[PDB]
Amino acid sequence: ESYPYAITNPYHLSTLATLFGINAPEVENSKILELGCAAGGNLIPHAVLYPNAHFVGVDLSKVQIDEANKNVRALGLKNIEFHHCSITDIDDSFGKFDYIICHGVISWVPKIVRDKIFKVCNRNLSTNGIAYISYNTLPGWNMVRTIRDMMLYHSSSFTNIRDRIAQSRLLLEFVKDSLEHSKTPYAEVLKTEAGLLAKQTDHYLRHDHLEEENAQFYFHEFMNEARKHNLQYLADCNISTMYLGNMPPKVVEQLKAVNDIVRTEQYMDFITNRRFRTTLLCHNDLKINRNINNDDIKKFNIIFNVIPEKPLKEVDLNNATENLQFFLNGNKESNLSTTSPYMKAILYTFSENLNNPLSFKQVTSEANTKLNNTKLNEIKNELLNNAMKLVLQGYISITNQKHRSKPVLDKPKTTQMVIYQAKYTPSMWVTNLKHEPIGVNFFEKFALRYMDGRNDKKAIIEAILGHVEKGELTLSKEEIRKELESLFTPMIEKFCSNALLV
Amino acid sequence: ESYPYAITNPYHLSTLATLFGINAPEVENSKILELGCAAGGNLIPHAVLYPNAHFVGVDLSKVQIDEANKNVRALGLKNIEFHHCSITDIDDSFGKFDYIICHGVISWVPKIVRDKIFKVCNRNLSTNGIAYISYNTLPGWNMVRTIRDMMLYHSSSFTNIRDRIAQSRLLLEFVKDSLEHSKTPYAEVLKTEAGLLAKQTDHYLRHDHLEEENAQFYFHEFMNEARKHNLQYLADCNISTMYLGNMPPKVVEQLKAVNDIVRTEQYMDFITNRRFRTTLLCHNDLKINRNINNDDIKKFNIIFNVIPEKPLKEVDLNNATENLQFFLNGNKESNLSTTSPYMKAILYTFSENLNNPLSFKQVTSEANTKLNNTKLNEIKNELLNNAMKLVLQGYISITNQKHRSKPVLDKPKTTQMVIYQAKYTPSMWVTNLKHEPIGVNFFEKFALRYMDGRNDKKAIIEAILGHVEKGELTLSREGQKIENKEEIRKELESLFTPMIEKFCSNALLV
Ligand SMILES: Nc1ncnc2c1ncn2[C@@H]1O[C@H](CSCC[C@H](N)C(=O)O)[C@@H](O)[C@H]1O
Ligand SMILES: Nc1ncnc2c1ncn2[C@@H]1O[C@H](CSCC[C@H](N)C(=O)O)[C@@H](O)[C@H]1O
């Protein structure tokens, strides 16, 4: 189970670099390095997308690297190589990379390897390159460490990994039952954290990992190390963690009064109990511009994943007594509502383009055709006044990736990575065109096996029919017929709006 | 400022020893050692109370030990020694002690000194003696450490201790400002913690104290160190921290099943976020009896400090359907109510005996007089069935201390220690007979100066009046001053009766 992590997508690093006034290299011709890449699930899909780029993963585990290379051979990729070696084996002969991704390693490795990671992110980084390093942080990690301590101390039962996992689990359940009637805040925190741990699979409970030491960085100590290597802080990959606007305005003005972003970020870590950071680093020499304005939205392609409570053909967009509701990435609650004809036209245009970025001009022109082409100015005004605020709060995505051609649904066609995963892989998820893991059931997976752009609906349904009778697939003959076709159109919608169709 | 800590009282250690089947040494002739005694405010009041007991303090700070010796000399005590030396200087020549008190020390000292504290608590402890060691604990200490890390980080502004203090205060208020509207639970925990910290004085916030390393014990790690020295866990001095009865029965059954008290205690620390322990240890070879029965209440004198909502003379206790309310140490917020006439009679009896220990026979016979002396057996049954449960939950105090004879309020007489504190010391608090600091206002402190067991009420009032006229005490009406000789005499006579009640109920009168 080697997952892609969308937040490490080189196009995301490049986007964030653009936001802050850095011109990062074009992704399609770039060179990309992943440190501690495991079996390559966070790297291989990019190699498939960008045959003109070059990819290098490094991991100390020979079994993971062997699995990486097996999938490389299977996909026919000529642009990617995996090396079984330590990070500490990397030297100047590896060359310079435009993007360096190190996700979930630096907290778990000894000091000599942490120092090496910083040194590679300097020496092997291109002039305008971007380095990603993610790590656990105090104060938020305290609670996790406590539970690990708890599970180790009560786990002296037997010697086996397997046997010990079961009593770790029933210790989590025992904790739940213990706190049943407790109203204190700490009981609430511990109960939720234990519930999370219980949900996880055995690889995360296995006690050899529980015993592993975490570096327990504070942000300012991490940055101390990065600055020793002449790297400066660019951004967190979730920019909403940098948002100061939900705080009292005197406080915000005071935070701006001192100008250093590391101290401000550390302060926010202290008062928010921050447990994890996904940090972007770049070379000291670059001049970063943190002054962001509304018009900056025009620099980017935009995604706002919103689902309207009422369909478009049932509403009159110029009826301003009607407050219409849109659910964000979903949904119920966690939502927004508008009375504006212009904001309605904008939100309806985003809801037809889910996970398919639109330029400022594309969004506003398409919304204007819903307003009879008369409103372009008012629409541009409404988007300008709002977009960047919602981006900085994390509701809207910006990307340097371009709008994708509308998929043709007569003969639905998924991607090379996805067809491969559906045919040859046991996992119940696939990697979409945004480098996001998308969960699928058995019906959706078997159906993805057949979307090459050739087979029509009847053909795909028949190919799946080969699978149901000899399972393989079992759906929870005529009932099977229209049960299968009732599942078809919603599946196509899910694939088309989750960037699984080409 | 050197406070007494009532929880370290050797009579409290002895009481807990008795609860668990240990016969600890008689307090009045004992030998008592305090490690890291600072200025001796936790030791000196016992030397005053127990002329036939011997007391030894040890502290590394010359300034503190000098203050302790100044107060010993001021009090004229011959039974107490204060030594300026390290705990590492203690050896077999110091002799054996029946009680050893180490409070707020071991978490703050290097590993070698911690080793030595355990060693002393074995080698210098009498056969039946009790050692007390308190320390900060994980997981609860995480938050405190975090705030200290924050303060040190956010004030690094070179070179000025007072200015660094001002920056740390500014920081803490800035925190409170930042979290105002935010409703998340972490924000609330942090908010009140920084509130406590802002409340304190400058010596707790000085960066050199913030930089000091805490040992950060888990309980099982503390007990591992104690066991190396052949010390076993007796109990926590707040026994309510040991109580499992508020947890689901199946959980309580599993905990009871594992039959390891140190593991059970650790589990409770994890699920309650325990931040501090006050631990009693004793030699490994003593047989500790953990089976506690209702009738064990008969072994102890008892205090339950309850204030009735309604005066006894306004209620009929024999009424069984009326719900009567009682407020604990306090209160009006935290209370206990009952319709039982027998529990009512017991509760009014405790309310008349505040902070004065009562035997089982005393509680039940006095309760019976309220029920017309026909109820003795029912009242004994009520106390039997509820008392030890309330003890283990922390509501009722048990003590090996004797019942004290009633103070005669005619010529009120306070104790040697508090008459010293009131006359000769700047502090606004005094140390009562139970080793508790009791806050006093200016009128109460002045009054205490004059209660020698000779001055009657008229003479005490005349003395205080002299202070009001000398300019050293002012009385607000309020908020206009009351300046006329008569009418200040009037007001003083108004204030005297509740003051004598408060002293009487706070164990300040002999
Ligand atoms: N010194 C070293 N050099 C190269 N890889 C290392 C290393 N030390 C640890 N690793 C690798 O670092 C990884 C940490 S687990 C994280 C793996 C992957 N990025 C993911 O999130 O799924 C493991 O695959 C381990 O084999
Ligand atoms: N090695 C050592 N030997 C003797 N005293 C020490 C010591 N290390 C620290 N101390 C003393 O331990 C005390 C810690 S502060 C706690 C003091 C006191 N028990 C109270 O609670 O008020 C300080 O007075 C310090 O001087």
Curated annotation (Swiss-Prot), chain A:
Xref: Pfam families: Methyltransf_31, MethyTransf_Reg, PKMT_2nd
Annotated CDD domains: AdoMet_MTases
Superkingdom to which the source organism belongs: Bacteria
Family matches, as Gene3D superfamilies: Vaccinia Virus protein VP39
Protein name (database record): Uncharacterized protein RP789
Species assigned in the record: Rickettsia prowazekii (strain Madrid E)
